[PDB]
Design a protein around this ligand. Structure first.
Ligand SMILES: Nc1ncnc2[nH]cnc12
Ligand SMILES: [Mg+2]
Length: 314
């Protein structure tokens, strides 16, 4: 599991890299106290890596953790007070979902580098105040939504990440590929990029179902056609839709004629979990302008009909 170290080797997010570069160098010169950065990112976008970079650039250690991971305040304290020495980075991924209390503890630490703590148990216990070193916290979010209360207030830098361009993805599919033990023409990779979903995570995660299908017989090469056959066999349209996605529109279009449906009976008749439907497939579908949510129910874009090779109605 080797990944880019330098902010340079990082494939993508130029505006962000520049914006970061500014905050770093300015701080490597000013001081290692990099303000409390907060990366916002569309759902499913690799932020950790960048954190390792931001960490490597600053030349400090990185303690990665999820929002859920922080189970009790203790865990947060035990990290800021021990694991971390001045200048290090505590990465609270998915920071939007922290423990009500765990959060309340992050406030102080982020603001004045001092966290209190409920020592002992019952009425036979007291409260101590632990002084924390100067560290920088990087919070990442899948739900940029202000679904981050005034915890937002205590942040220095607050940037966003855009999806990755098919090329950036390919550049990554190939960069990650070749060095990994498989060889594939750029056209091939880039045909996987396009198929991916702006997500690097998915980019490499798809390539995995390609390099596992084609190079089984013929080994030394994967050309577009090769990859193509692969993607093809796997059920991937030039639009990135997985076999199922298609079917969803399919049913929408045919079963309910596309007319307002209602996640309710769609998931039901579509024989699937509403949440699954709504939480897993619908997204990309809406983003690709194929599906649309309306007060009346789920409906399919013209483009849907036009994609599934139908006559966009009336
Ligand atoms: N920026 C990036 N470059 C290469 N591989 C990555 N994996 C996740 N983010 C990446
Ligand atoms: Mg993580």
């Amino acid at each position: 599991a080797l990944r880019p170290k330098t902010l340079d080797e990082y494939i993508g997010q130029e505006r962000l890299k520049q914006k970061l570069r500014v905050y770093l160098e300015a701080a490597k010169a000013r001081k290692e106290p990099l303000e409390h950065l907060l990366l916002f990112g569309p759902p499913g976008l690799g932020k950790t890596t960048l954190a390792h970079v931001i960490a490597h650039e600053l030349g400090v250690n990185l303690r990665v953790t999820s929002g859920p991971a922080i189970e009790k305040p203790g865990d947060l304290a035990a990290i800021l007070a021990n694991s971390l020495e001045e200048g290090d980075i505590l990465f609270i991924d998915e920071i939007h979902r922290l423990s009500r209390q765990a959060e309340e503890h992050l406030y102080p630490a982020m603001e004045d580098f001092v966290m209190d703590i409920v020592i002992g148990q019952g009425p036979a216990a007291r409260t101590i105040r632990l002084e924390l070193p100067r560290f920088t916290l990087i919070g990442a979010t899948t739900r940029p939504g202000l679904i981050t209360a005034p915890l937002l207030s205590r942040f220095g830098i607050v940037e966003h990440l855009e999806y990755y361009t098919p090329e950036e993805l390919a550049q990554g599919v190939m960069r990650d590929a070749r060095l990994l033990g498989v060889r594939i023409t750029e056209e091939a990779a880039l045909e996987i990029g396009r198929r991916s979903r702006g997500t690097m995570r998915v980019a490499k995660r798809l390539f995995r179902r390609v390099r596992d299908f084609a190079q089984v017989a013929g080994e030394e090469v994967i050309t577009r056609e090769r990859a193509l056959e692969a993607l093809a066999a796997l059920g991937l349209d030039e639009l990135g839709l997985e076999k199922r996605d298609r079917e969803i529109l399919e049913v929408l279009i045919l079963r309910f004629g596309g007319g307002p449906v209602g996640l309710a009976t769609l998931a039901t008749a579509l024989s699937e979990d509403p949440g699954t439907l709504e939480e897993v497939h619908e997204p990309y579908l809406i983003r690709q302008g194929l599906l649309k949510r309306t007060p009346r129910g789920r409906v399919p874009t013209e483009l849907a009909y036009r994609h599934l090779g139908y006559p966009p109605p009336v």
